[PDB]
Structure formats: structure tokens, C-alpha cells
Design an enzyme around this catalytic site. Structure first.
Site, short mmCIF file in Angstrom:
data_model
loop_
_atom_site.label_atom_id
_atom_site.label_comp_id
_atom_site.label_asym_id
_atom_site.label_seq_id
_atom_site.Cartn_x
_atom_site.Cartn_y
_atom_site.Cartn_z
N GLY A 53 2.12 -5.84 13.37
CA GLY A 53 3.29 -5.31 14.03
C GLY A 53 4.45 -4.99 13.11
O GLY A 53 5.46 -4.44 13.59
N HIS A 58 -0.25 6.25 11.48
CA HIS A 58 -1.45 5.58 11.99
C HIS A 58 -1.20 4.95 13.37
O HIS A 58 -2.15 4.44 13.98
CB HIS A 58 -2.03 4.56 10.99
CG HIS A 58 -1.19 3.34 10.70
ND1 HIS A 58 -0.89 2.39 11.66
CD2 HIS A 58 -0.67 2.88 9.54
CE1 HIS A 58 -0.19 1.42 11.10
NE2 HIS A 58 -0.04 1.69 9.82
N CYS A 86 4.48 -2.87 10.60
CA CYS A 86 4.50 -1.50 10.10
C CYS A 86 5.74 -0.77 10.58
O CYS A 86 6.23 -0.99 11.69
CB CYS A 86 3.25 -0.76 10.55
SG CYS A 86 1.82 -1.31 9.65
C1 LIG Z 1 1.00 -2.34 10.84
O1 LIG Z 1 1.78 -3.14 11.69
C2 LIG Z 1 -0.07 -3.16 10.12
C3 LIG Z 1 0.55 -4.19 9.17
C4 LIG Z 1 -0.44 -5.18 8.54
C5 LIG Z 1 -1.11 -6.11 9.53
C6 LIG Z 1 -1.34 -7.38 8.75
N1 LIG Z 1 -0.31 -7.32 7.72
C7 LIG Z 1 0.18 -6.12 7.53
O2 LIG Z 1 0.96 -5.78 6.63
N2 LIG Z 1 -0.96 -2.26 9.39
C8 LIG Z 1 -2.22 -2.04 9.75
O3 LIG Z 1 -2.74 -2.60 10.72
C9 LIG Z 1 -3.02 -1.06 8.91
C10 LIG Z 1 -3.53 0.12 9.75
C11 LIG Z 1 -4.88 0.43 9.12
O4 LIG Z 1 -5.74 1.16 9.99
C12 LIG Z 1 -5.29 2.49 10.21
C13 LIG Z 1 -5.45 -0.96 8.88
N3 LIG Z 1 -4.25 -1.69 8.43
C14 LIG Z 1 -4.21 -2.78 7.65
O5 LIG Z 1 -3.15 -3.18 7.17
C15 LIG Z 1 -5.53 -3.50 7.37
N4 LIG Z 1 -5.92 -3.23 6.00
C16 LIG Z 1 -7.04 -2.55 5.71
O6 LIG Z 1 -7.74 -2.00 6.53
O7 LIG Z 1 -7.26 -2.61 4.40
C17 LIG Z 1 -8.35 -1.87 3.74
C18 LIG Z 1 -8.09 -0.39 3.91
C19 LIG Z 1 -8.30 -2.28 2.29
C20 LIG Z 1 -9.67 -2.27 4.37
C21 LIG Z 1 -5.37 -5.00 7.66
C22 LIG Z 1 -5.06 -5.27 9.12
C23 LIG Z 1 -6.61 -5.78 7.23
#
Ligand SMILES: *[C@H](O)[C@H](C[C@@H]1CCNC1=O)NC(=O)[C@@H]1C[C@H](OC)CN1C(=O)[C@@H](NC(=O)OC(C)(C)C)C(C)C
Ligand SMILES: *[C@H](O)[C@H](C[C@@H]1CCNC1=O)NC(=O)[C@@H]1C[C@H](OC)CN1C(=O)[C@@H](NC(=O)OC(C)(C)C)C(C)C
Ligand SMILES: [Cl-]
Ligand SMILES: [Cl-]
Ligand code: NA
Ligand code: NA
EC number: 3.4.19.12
Lengths: 301, 306
Positions: free
Chosen positions: A143, A41, A145
Site C-alpha cells: 500500500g 501498475h 506505492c
Molecule cells: C505498492 O504499494 C507495492 C509496494 C511494495 C509492497 C511490499 N513492499 C513494497 O514496497 N508494490 C507492488 O506491489 C509492486 C507491484 C508489482 O506488480 C505489478 C509487484 N510489486 C512488488 O513490489 C513485488 N515485487 C516484485 O514482484 O518483485 C520482482 C519483480 C523482483 C519479482 C513485491 C510485492 C514482492
């Protein structure tokens, strides 16, 4: 004596962590030999987070679209490929700090160490378990991930988790190092929710054995139980079923302490019924379920 | 989000661990520059365990009595001396993996990471606190002596603990890296015991802030108190006094959450006087006191180590 949430020393993994940037997104990668593994991603754009077509997005990338930094050194990307939800960036230099390693996909109830990282640099190390609902209860910020989970039994690093997602309840989802998610989750922003979680019964029993090894007996009793009656009770408290495999696995701890597995199950039944009445077990007032039988033998012996 | 008991990354310290053998005793040493540090009780024997005269036991020793192994390579000892309860073995080779480091002595309530080692090989890492009674609640077996505790700041490792002893309640005693014990303990087989311990109040408050940051708010209330009044409650519940300096250190967490320290103290007072009513805070049914304010800020902001 003593009993702690004990992680593996993180140095062998620290030497593999790099920073990966694509577009405006930065996260961590894992540099093993001449390949950097990271969450795919990283190539999503803000227009395209709900239903990204990753094959179409990736074919449009040049190697120079991926900025890979190892400490102070930029690594040159010379190829790229996608394996399930992981991107593999081929680089022109092999990591000289590559440890002995393997990739393993783990089962719910298994534990591992997490090296939480930001911008390719380590922040801290902690212990996690794969929950029955295929989430982990991590500590992860923007950040993080590409941070990985691992075990180092003996001299070989077994990588089992790469971090991808935070779910609405504040728990975490990710993949094995072949890029297959644990659980039903997908790397899309479509609505997703963790299932109801349950307690890892075999691990609670392992930790009660740890308590006995460390000199606690107050929760033992003179009763026993059949396996099926134990499971009928335990499921009323949202505990996972105990299988004959679990009973077999607890054999060594049973032998060491002289407490039959089903006798310890009767202790657990009574603890669920009564609570601790102001007492603690190994410094906890709750029944701990993120130590495996293997973990207890590693730490107590 | 999330909040875990988190240790420092241990790689800088792993490269410093060696095995030290004297007679039939094997334990760990810390190899920094051209000196290996280890507990001086490595020179005792089963016919001397009770009341050794360390001054006099070391002169009988020569350099070749100390076998030091860095992995599978022997390090030649070329000198030896004692500093308080720590032995310093000069070796002919400087450790090429020596990090930027310094030796520090920590205060009760401060936390640190322990790299548990056996036979010179790192085996596990966990987070501890120096208890008010100057013990640590470690996890250590035979052969663990010489395992060290540390913190990292930026790029500098601050070594603060070396492991020496297990007390009868299963808690642990050791020294700073200048060989001064924490607590009123000595390195020989005479009667000794952990004193009664207390709870680290400023750390409980820091952890309650961590809880609020992570969405756990049920214990908050409309009330506030004074430092004087709360310290009477702290004394009643065997909690350490809260000082104005503690209040100041928590300032940043107060500003971020909107809960002043004495407002949170009113929460803690009610928790002590009433309990948790069956609820949990950050997955615990006890009040956790082995996170410092800095630990909370560091974990919740993603600080990394270079
Ligand atoms: C990568 O660094 C990051 C880690 C997250 C940021 C906050 N805590 C973590 O563990 N991951 C993302 O940003 C990841 C990418 C997705 O989009 C492609 C959205 N991401 C999320 O973790 C988000 N969750 C999300 O969208 O959850 C659902 C699918 C249930 C809506 C989060 C930022 C809310
Ligand atoms: C060093 O590897 C070792 C670590 C111990 C072993 C069990 N868990 C640990 O933390 N330390 C010792 O063996 C140390 C040397 C002393 O003799 C010079 C005896 N030691 C102990 O830790 C013993 N404690 C002890 O004697 O406690 C008093 C002084 C209260 C009797 C312990 C092995 C019983
Ligand atoms: Cl008020
Ligand atoms: Cl608890
Ligand atoms: Na796999
Ligand atoms: Na209040």
C-alpha cells in the site's frame, strides 16, 4: 552541534497526498494543481501482472473507474493519460494546498526525504539515498506505492522519487515524477534483481568532514595519497570511484576544516584498513554514506 | 520491508512555528490558540548572561518589547507571563492552524520527533530519545531554541520538549511545555554537564525484534535466561534495568516472532559479552536504543496519522 539523519519538514508534501483505487488495488497519489500522479501498475489485474500491456489496459478505463479520495472528499476524475510508468489523472478541482514545486531526476549518491504513506495518509518521514545500483533502502509495506521522495531547499519542493516496487533483497525501486525508473527496473513481475551495491565514497568523506567540524580528530593521520592510488585501494573495498568532480565538491568543507581532500582520503584509507578499534564516529561504528557534501553544509552551517 | 529511523509527519507542528525577538535575541516560539510559548532566556542580555533573576527581568518588559512574526505577519502581543522556564506571550489572534494537541511530560527512554527551526521557519525533522541522563542527542545550532519535540497519536499532537541549551559534550537540554527542565539543568551560564549515560535496554530489545521481523536472525540462540540473571548483566554493561512491565510491553513482538523476551535477553547477553563478530544488525554495528516497542510496532504495521 550534533549530527542527525535529518529530513525536510513534510507538511508541504502531506497536503498533496491522496488515495487512488482502481479495481481492487489501492495506493497513494500526489495531487498537484488539477493532476493526481500515481504508479500506473494500479491498473494491473491479478491475471495480468507478468506482462501487462498498459496502453491496452488504460484505453479500457473510464474516468469513473478511478476512485480518488482526498481526506474525506472524493475527487472527480475527468481525464487520464500515461507518461512512462506514471498515470496522470486530471481532476475537476485544483489542490488548494499545492506548494511551489518542481520535478527533478537525481543521480546516484543524492539524498532525499521520503514521506511514507498508506491510504493517502502519512505514516512517517525519513532520509534515503539513491544507491549506486539505483535502488533505495526504504521502509515500505503493502500500500505504500505512490509515496514520494523530495527535497525542500529554500521554499520549493523538488520531487525526485515515486515508489513502485520492492526487490527480493528488501530494497526498493521507483521512478522520477516523469515516470522513468531509476535503474534497469520495470513495473512487471518478471525476474529482476539489484546489481551489487557499492559505497558512496564522496558521501563518506563528507561525513568525515562533519565529524571534524563537530570536534573529532582521532582518525586523522599524517599521510596523503594521490587520487588514483586512493581509487585503487577504495575499489578493493567496493567503494565507488572518487572523481575530480567529487574532489572539487568537497573543496568548501576542506577549506572550513583545514584538511585537504586527499589528506582526508588517506584517513579513509586507514579506516578501511584498520576499522575503528572500538571507537565511533558521529555515533556510528560503520562508515556512513547517506550524507552528501551539501547535506553536511546544510546541517553543520 | 525495511526499517528506518522514522519521524512523525511534521505538518501539524510546522503551522505553529513563529519567530520571537526580544532585544538582540531571536529564537522560535510555538503558537497555539492565542498564546506563543518560548524559552524564558529570550529576555536575557550579554550583560546579564551569567545569573539572571527572571522574576525581576520580566517586569521591566512591556508587550511591545516582544516582536512575534508568523511568516511575514506581525502578531500583536497583548500580555506576557512566565511559567517555570517558559514564557507565555498572549497575542491578539488565535492560530487558525492550531491542531488538536496536549502537553505531556515524557519518561527517559521515550522517543519523539524534533522539528528543528530557525527564525520561525522549520528547517528539518529528526527522531530523538530522552536519554536516561535526561539529555537528548540533538542537532541544534544558534537560533534553534524554541524548537519543539512531539509525538502524534491518531489526530492529536502531544508536545513534550522545547529546546533551551547545549551542554559541553554537544548534547542538549530543554523543558516540557510547562517549562520544567528534563534533568537537573538550569537556564543560565553556570557550570553544568551531562551525567554518565546508560543504554535503554527495552529499546535495544525492541530493535532486535525489528531485526528479526526484517530477516536478521544470526544473533538468535537456543538459550533463555531469567529477569534476575539478565539484570545483573545489564548492570555490568551500564544498561538500564529490565522490568516486568518492559517484558509485558514486548509481549506482542514475542508472540509475532516466536522469541520470548528472556530468550532475546540471552541473545543480548551474548552480544554484550561477545560482540558482533564483524556482523551487522539492521545496518548497524552498534546496538541501537532509540526505537521503543511502540515505534517498532507502528513502523512495521504502517500506522498513519489523521
Ligand atoms: C505498492 O504499494 C507495492 C509496494 C511494495 C509492497 C511490499 N513492499 C513494497 O514496497 N508494490 C507492488 O506491489 C509492486 C507491484 C508489482 O506488480 C505489478 C509487484 N510489486 C512488488 O513490489 C513485488 N515485487 C516484485 O514482484 O518483485 C520482482 C519483480 C523482483 C519479482 C513485491 C510485492 C514482492
Ligand atoms: C538557543 O537558540 C541556543 C541554542 C544553542 C546554541 C548552540 N546550540 C544550541 O543548542 N541556546 C543558548 O544560546 C543558551 C542560552 C544560555 O544563556 C542564557 C547559553 N546557551 C547555551 O546553549 C550555551 N550553553 C551553555 O552556556 O552551557 C553551560 C551552561 C554548560 C555553560 C552554548 C551556546 C555554549
Ligand atoms: Cl537455556
Ligand atoms: Cl553503526
Ligand atoms: Na525527468
Ligand atoms: Na536465545
Amino acid at each position: 552541534s550534533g549530527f542527525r539523519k535529518m529530513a525536510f519538514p513534510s507538511g508541504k508534501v502531506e497536503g498533496c497526498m491522496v488515495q487512488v483505487t482502481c479495481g481492487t488495488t489501492t495506493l497513494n497519489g500526489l495531487w498537484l494543481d488539477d493532476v493526481v500522479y500515481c504508479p500506473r501498475h494500479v491498473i494491473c489485474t491479478s491475471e495480468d501482472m507478468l506482462n501487462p500491456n498498459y496502453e491496452d489496459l488504460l484505453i479500457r478505463k473510464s474516468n469513473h473507474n478511478f476512485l480518488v479520495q482526498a481526506g474525506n472528499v472524493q475527487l472527480r476524475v475527468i481525464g487520464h493519460s500515461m507518461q512512462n510508468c506514471v498515470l496522470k489523472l486530471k481532476v475537476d478541482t485544483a489542490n488548494p494546498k499545492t506548494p511551489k514545486y518542481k520535478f527533478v531526476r537525481i543521480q546516484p549518491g543524492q539524498t532525499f526525504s521520503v514521506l511514507a504513506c498508506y491510504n493517502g495518509s502519512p505514516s512517517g518521514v525519513y532520509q534515503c539515498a539513491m544507491r549506486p545500483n539505483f535502488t533505495i533502502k526504504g521502509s515500505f509495506l503493502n500500500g505504500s506505492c505512490g509515496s514520494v521522495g523530495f527535497n525542500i531547499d529554500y521554499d520549493c519542493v523538488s520531487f525526485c522519487y515515486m515508489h513502485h516496487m520492492e526487490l527480493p533483497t528488501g530494497v526498493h525501486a521507483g521512478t522520477d515524477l516523469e515516470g522513468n525508473f531509476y535503474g534497469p527496473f520495470v513495473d512487471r513481475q518478471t525476474a529482476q534483481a539489484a546489481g551489487t551495491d557499492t559505497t558512496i565514497t564522496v558521501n563518506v568523506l563528507a561525513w568525515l568532514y562533519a565529524a571534524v567540524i563537530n570536534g573529532d580528530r582521532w582518525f586523522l593521520n599524517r599521510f596523503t595519497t594521490t587520487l588514483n592510488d586512493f581509487n585503487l585501494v577504495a575499489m578493493k573495498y567496493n567503494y565507488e570511484p572518487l572523481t575530480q568532480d567529487h574532489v572539487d565538491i568537497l573543496g568548501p568543507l576542506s577549506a572550513q576544516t583545514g584538511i585537504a581532500v586527499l589528506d582526508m582520503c588517506a584517513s579513509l584509507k586507514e579506516l578501511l584498513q584498520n576499522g575503528m578499534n572500538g571507537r565511533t564516529i558521529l555515533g556510528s561504528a560503520l562508515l556512513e554514506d547517506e550524507f552528501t557534501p551539501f547535506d553536511v553544509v546544510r546541517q553543520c552551517s
